[PDB]
Scaffold this active site. Sequence first.
Site, PDB file in Angstrom:
ATOM      1  N   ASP A  92      -7.030 -10.342 -11.338  1.00 17.41           N
ATOM      2  CA  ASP A  92      -7.564  -9.198 -10.954  1.00 17.41           C
ATOM      3  C   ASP A  92      -7.571  -8.080 -11.984  1.00 17.41           C
ATOM      4  O   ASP A  92      -6.732  -8.230 -13.023  1.00 17.41           O
ATOM      5  CB  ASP A  92      -6.665  -8.997  -9.500  1.00 17.41           C
ATOM      6  CG  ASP A  92      -7.664  -7.646  -8.594  1.00 17.41           C
ATOM      7  OD1 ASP A  92      -8.789  -7.329  -9.070  1.00 17.41           O
ATOM      8  OD2 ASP A  92      -7.178  -7.641  -7.559  1.00 17.41           O
ATOM      9  N   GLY A  94      -6.559  -5.057 -11.615  1.00 16.13           N
ATOM     10  CA  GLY A  94      -5.437  -4.041 -11.565  1.00 16.13           C
ATOM     11  C   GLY A  94      -5.836  -2.879 -10.708  1.00 16.13           C
ATOM     12  O   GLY A  94      -4.773  -1.892 -10.522  1.00 16.13           O
ATOM     13  N   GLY A  95      -6.747  -2.422 -10.341  1.00 17.46           N
ATOM     14  CA  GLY A  95      -7.393  -1.539  -9.554  1.00 17.46           C
ATOM     15  C   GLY A  95      -6.556  -1.279  -8.508  1.00 17.46           C
ATOM     16  O   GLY A  95      -5.902  -0.324  -8.323  1.00 17.46           O
ATOM     17  N   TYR A  96      -6.680  -2.452  -7.758  1.00 14.75           N
ATOM     18  CA  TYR A  96      -5.796  -2.411  -6.318  1.00 14.75           C
ATOM     19  C   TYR A  96      -4.249  -1.958  -6.372  1.00 14.75           C
ATOM     20  O   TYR A  96      -3.727  -1.234  -5.620  1.00 14.75           O
ATOM     21  CB  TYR A  96      -6.015  -3.526  -5.404  1.00 14.75           C
ATOM     22  CG  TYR A  96      -5.493  -3.457  -4.301  1.00 14.75           C
ATOM     23  CD1 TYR A  96      -6.123  -3.257  -2.836  1.00 14.75           C
ATOM     24  CD2 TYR A  96      -4.198  -4.069  -4.095  1.00 14.75           C
ATOM     25  CE1 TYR A  96      -5.586  -3.150  -1.782  1.00 14.75           C
ATOM     26  CE2 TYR A  96      -3.651  -3.925  -2.788  1.00 14.75           C
ATOM     27  CZ  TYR A  96      -4.331  -3.664  -1.600  1.00 14.75           C
ATOM     28  OH  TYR A  96      -3.803  -3.464  -0.149  1.00 14.75           O
ATOM     29  N   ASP A 143     -12.241  -1.681 -10.763  1.00 18.09           N
ATOM     30  CA  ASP A 143     -12.918  -0.844  -9.570  1.00 18.09           C
ATOM     31  C   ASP A 143     -12.013  -0.125  -9.097  1.00 18.09           C
ATOM     32  O   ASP A 143     -10.979   0.226  -9.606  1.00 18.09           O
ATOM     33  CB  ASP A 143     -13.672  -2.039  -8.648  1.00 18.09           C
ATOM     34  CG  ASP A 143     -12.367  -2.862  -7.912  1.00 18.09           C
ATOM     35  OD1 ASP A 143     -11.334  -2.827  -8.554  1.00 18.09           O
ATOM     36  OD2 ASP A 143     -12.739  -3.257  -6.777  1.00 18.09           O
ATOM     37  N   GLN A 190     -18.444  -2.549  -3.338  1.00 19.55           N
ATOM     38  CA  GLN A 190     -17.775  -1.707  -2.537  1.00 19.55           C
ATOM     39  C   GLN A 190     -18.494  -1.092  -1.506  1.00 19.55           C
ATOM     40  O   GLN A 190     -19.557  -1.686  -1.354  1.00 19.55           O
ATOM     41  CB  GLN A 190     -16.952  -0.716  -3.449  1.00 19.55           C
ATOM     42  CG  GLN A 190     -15.849  -0.977  -4.458  1.00 19.55           C
ATOM     43  CD  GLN A 190     -14.650  -1.637  -3.733  1.00 19.55           C
ATOM     44  OE1 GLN A 190     -14.343  -1.112  -2.576  1.00 19.55           O
ATOM     45  NE2 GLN A 190     -13.901  -2.189  -4.317  1.00 19.55           N
ATOM     46  N   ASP A 267      -8.047 -15.754  -2.395  1.00 18.79           N
ATOM     47  CA  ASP A 267      -6.676 -15.819  -2.716  1.00 18.79           C
ATOM     48  C   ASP A 267      -5.864 -15.234  -1.525  1.00 18.79           C
ATOM     49  O   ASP A 267      -6.511 -15.043  -0.420  1.00 18.79           O
ATOM     50  CB  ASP A 267      -6.535 -14.715  -3.613  1.00 18.79           C
ATOM     51  CG  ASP A 267      -7.145 -13.177  -3.307  1.00 18.79           C
ATOM     52  OD1 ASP A 267      -7.374 -13.019  -2.114  1.00 18.79           O
ATOM     53  OD2 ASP A 267      -7.630 -12.537  -4.362  1.00 18.79           O
ATOM     54  N   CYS A 303       0.325 -33.154   7.985  1.00 22.78           N
ATOM     55  CA  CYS A 303       0.379 -32.616   6.589  1.00 22.78           C
ATOM     56  C   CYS A 303       0.779 -33.828   5.815  1.00 22.78           C
ATOM     57  O   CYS A 303       1.763 -34.519   5.958  1.00 22.78           O
ATOM     58  CB  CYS A 303       1.287 -31.598   6.313  1.00 22.78           C
ATOM     59  SG  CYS A 303       1.162 -30.824   4.830  1.00 22.78           S
ATOM     60  N   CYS A 305       1.818 -33.602   2.395  1.00 22.52           N
ATOM     61  CA  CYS A 305       2.510 -33.060   1.310  1.00 22.52           C
ATOM     62  C   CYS A 305       3.804 -33.533   1.232  1.00 22.52           C
ATOM     63  O   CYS A 305       4.302 -34.163   2.188  1.00 22.52           O
ATOM     64  CB  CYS A 305       2.566 -31.244   1.542  1.00 22.52           C
ATOM     65  SG  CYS A 305       4.118 -30.740   2.517  1.00 22.52           S
TER      66      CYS A 305
HETATM   67  N1  LIG Z   1      -9.592  -5.170  -7.790  1.00 22.28           N
HETATM   68  C1  LIG Z   1      -9.622  -5.233  -6.423  1.00 22.28           C
HETATM   69  N2  LIG Z   1      -8.559  -6.205  -5.720  1.00 22.28           N
HETATM   70  C2  LIG Z   1      -8.657  -6.010  -4.408  1.00 22.28           C
HETATM   71  C3  LIG Z   1      -7.477  -6.784  -3.917  1.00 22.28           C
HETATM   72  C4  LIG Z   1      -7.221  -6.585  -2.514  1.00 22.28           C
HETATM   73  N3  LIG Z   1      -6.262  -7.360  -1.769  1.00 22.28           N
HETATM   74  C5  LIG Z   1      -6.708  -6.809  -0.496  1.00 22.28           C
HETATM   75  N4  LIG Z   1      -5.728  -7.261   0.601  1.00 22.28           N
HETATM   76  C6  LIG Z   1      -4.575  -7.768   0.636  1.00 22.28           C
HETATM   77  C7  LIG Z   1      -3.467  -6.857   0.121  1.00 22.28           C
HETATM   78  N5  LIG Z   1      -2.207  -7.614  -0.028  1.00 22.28           N
HETATM   79  C8  LIG Z   1      -1.345  -7.803   1.184  1.00 22.28           C
HETATM   80  C9  LIG Z   1      -0.159  -8.747   0.729  1.00 22.28           C
HETATM   81  O1  LIG Z   1       0.877  -7.978  -0.152  1.00 22.28           O
HETATM   82  C10 LIG Z   1      -0.021  -7.753  -1.356  1.00 22.28           C
HETATM   83  C11 LIG Z   1      -1.409  -7.189  -1.139  1.00 22.28           C
HETATM   84  N6  LIG Z   1      -7.815  -6.088  -0.143  1.00 22.28           N
HETATM   85  C12 LIG Z   1      -8.244  -6.201  -1.498  1.00 22.28           C
HETATM   86  C13 LIG Z   1      -9.332  -5.304  -2.202  1.00 22.28           C
HETATM   87  C14 LIG Z   1      -9.501  -5.129  -3.589  1.00 22.28           C
HETATM   88  C15 LIG Z   1     -10.523  -4.461  -4.213  1.00 22.28           C
HETATM   89  O2  LIG Z   1     -11.604  -3.873  -3.460  1.00 22.28           O
HETATM   90  N7  LIG Z   1     -10.623  -4.454  -5.506  1.00 22.28           N
HETATM   91 ZN   LIG Z   2       3.443 -30.227   4.454  1.00 21.36          ZN
END
Ligand SMILES: Nc1nc2cc3[nH]c(NCCN4CCOCC4)nc3cc2c(=O)[nH]1
Ligand SMILES: [Zn+2]
Lengths: 368, 368
Positions: A92, A94-96, A143, A190, A267, A303, A305
């Site tokens: 990612d 780093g924006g978020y 972003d 966005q 993710d 499962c 695993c």
């Molecule tokens: N660059 C970028 N990265 C994003 C990452 C995102 N993560 C989420 N939601 C999940 C948030 N988690 C919740 C659990 O703890 C960690 C953060 N929503 C997200 C939205 C973005 C986004 O618009 N841009």
């Molecule tokens: Zn399992």
Amino acid sequence: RPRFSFSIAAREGKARTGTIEMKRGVIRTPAFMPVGTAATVKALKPETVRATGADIILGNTYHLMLRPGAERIAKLGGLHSFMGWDRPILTDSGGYQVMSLTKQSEEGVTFKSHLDGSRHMLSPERSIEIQHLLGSDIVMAFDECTPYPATPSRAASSMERSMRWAKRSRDAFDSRKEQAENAALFGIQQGSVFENLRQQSADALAEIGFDGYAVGGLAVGEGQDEMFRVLDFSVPMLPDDKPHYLMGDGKPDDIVGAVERGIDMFDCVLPTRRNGQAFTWDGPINIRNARFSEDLKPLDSECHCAVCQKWSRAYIHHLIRAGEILGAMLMTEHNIAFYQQLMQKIRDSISEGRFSQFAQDFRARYFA
Amino acid sequence: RPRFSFSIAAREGKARTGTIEMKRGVIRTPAFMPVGTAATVKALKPETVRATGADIILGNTYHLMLRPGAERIAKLGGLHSFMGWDRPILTDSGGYQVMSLTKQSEEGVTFKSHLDGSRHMLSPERSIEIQHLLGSDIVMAFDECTPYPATPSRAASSMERSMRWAKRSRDAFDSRKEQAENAALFGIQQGSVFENLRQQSADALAEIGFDGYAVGGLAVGEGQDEMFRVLDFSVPMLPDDKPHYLMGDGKPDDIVGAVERGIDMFDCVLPTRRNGQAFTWDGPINIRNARFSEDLKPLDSECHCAVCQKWSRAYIHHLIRAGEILGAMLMTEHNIAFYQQLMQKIRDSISEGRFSQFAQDFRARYFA
Ligand SMILES: Nc1nc2cc3[nH]c(NCCN4CCOCC4)nc3cc2c(=O)[nH]1
Ligand SMILES: [Zn+2]
Ligand SMILES: Nc1nc2cc3[nH]c(NCCN4CCOCC4)nc3cc2c(=O)[nH]1
Ligand SMILES: [Zn+2]
């Protein structure tokens, strides 16, 4: 293998299954990507992550630039070498995380580290550079993530800045020959919950051109109903022939519904983020609950695993209650393995044209 | 295999190498036994513990009786089944840990749990019973560990009580047919640093008769010089044809010197007890030290463990500094593997009649 090739093998409604081929490996889609925050998927060796079925893992520009440092990782041979994962890595931008964990401008953002209060900078150019230094295979455009709820005016301004930054990201990536020839670049849509802004964003990104397209700005508090509503109109706006990546912390039900709406990549910190929650086909359980103290059954009855082959709920209950590291190890391996089995069932069902039935059967049992 | 058979294959001075055969497996001696406090060797799956070379692990009557409970473990099928280790397990009797982590009498000890303040009882009979419920292969007699320093009068009184409790332990073990036929019982020599008391203790234990003999009451603050001095006269007092077990947290140098003095078995929290210390043939290092931040070498240059085959000091440095669980996993695996390689070199050198030379070479390099 090529730098990047996405092929769709089968479809059912909006759902797709196929493969992304990259130099470091093939990624089966729809894909779940375990999250490896500080150059580790928490409590697991890379070999264990691979054994669960993962084809690719996620790292983060923000965390890694703070510790151990992007330049340091480059000096040491890159992220893959450093952590011992030789398959693809998506990072990612780093924006978020900057805005989650500050001075903003059109140039980028300056901020203080949450670790030691040291001052840092991120911009489209610096973010792409950091991802290069890490040796990322899939690089995310830098972003500005729009908070929820957002007014139409603020969502528009943020989206427009993100599109200007997307072009800057594209140009920075392309100017670095080693990166352009060996890695891929994804753009991030966005526009908050607004259809017109989502359309403008999709059009801007497609005009620039990317290897893949993320739906950004969701999983930020809007809830599943709203998220699905926005996905309903947003995903079809993206180029059909490229992967679609939903950013955010998706539960099993989020993933199934998102795949029904055309998402190819996910993710999630959720399965990793030791707190006692274990996923099962009959829904999540909290292993800390006293009812599991003498339960000899595995975490989940089906499962495959290694954890479910060897240890009981009773044992894992004890480990987690006692705060033992092995508890985190076993819970994490099971949860990531469970997610991968979910993805495999999704891929197989789409390939066989019975995904709609799978989704119905999954939900009936998971929420019984 | 028999219930218990100790065979000495080779000797050099007071040092011995050989095997203990038991129903669940063979134990190569001199042996290092990783410690598995709360039914887990910290941060390692049992398969990983076995891969490092361990033939037997240690559990503890005190910790397990508090959490998850001895009766509970028995209901669940015993400790081996519960934690997934199918080879021999030695359990300490709980004596030391009660007084380390209270109302004492000739009958035993009552105490409050350090976990929840619940009241518990231990006696020779209850300790042996708990070890039965766990399904221990080597059962330790219940003793009273003498604090250091101790006056001759107090050391004598404590030693005498321990010998009365040793007989009670013997009788409790023998009266339980399943335990007597399948497990072994070790006595524990006491007497502090006093030769006459050590002799009286050895004579009492030999008269009762045990499968093995521990040297108790050391590694309690007396220091290595004093410990070695007491071992010099104490070990020869024990029956030569049975294993000799030194209880306490031995560093590599403690182990080498103790083997020179006739000890066959060791435990240690030290290699397990994540704090950053890694063992190497050139002495311990603390991986947290800034000097390792860009060091691409493995923890130790010769170590054949999986950690040293795959990851750098720089990576492990980062993990430990960041408090990542994988850091504890990798450090622990390396340290236990290092201890096992030490034991293997000791066994091989005694077998080849060059242990004295090995001890000299080891010390010269380890303390260079
Ligand atoms: N660059 C970028 N990265 C994003 C990452 C995102 N993560 C989420 N939601 C999940 C948030 N988690 C919740 C659990 O703890 C960690 C953060 N929503 C997200 C939205 C973005 C986004 O618009 N841009
Ligand atoms: Zn399992
Ligand atoms: N039953 C019994 N158990 C013993 C255990 C002993 N352990 C030690 N020394 C090491 C203490 N460690 C130091 C690291 O933290 C845990 C305790 N010294 C020990 C002595 C005895 C003993 O005399 N009897
Ligand atoms: Zn090693």
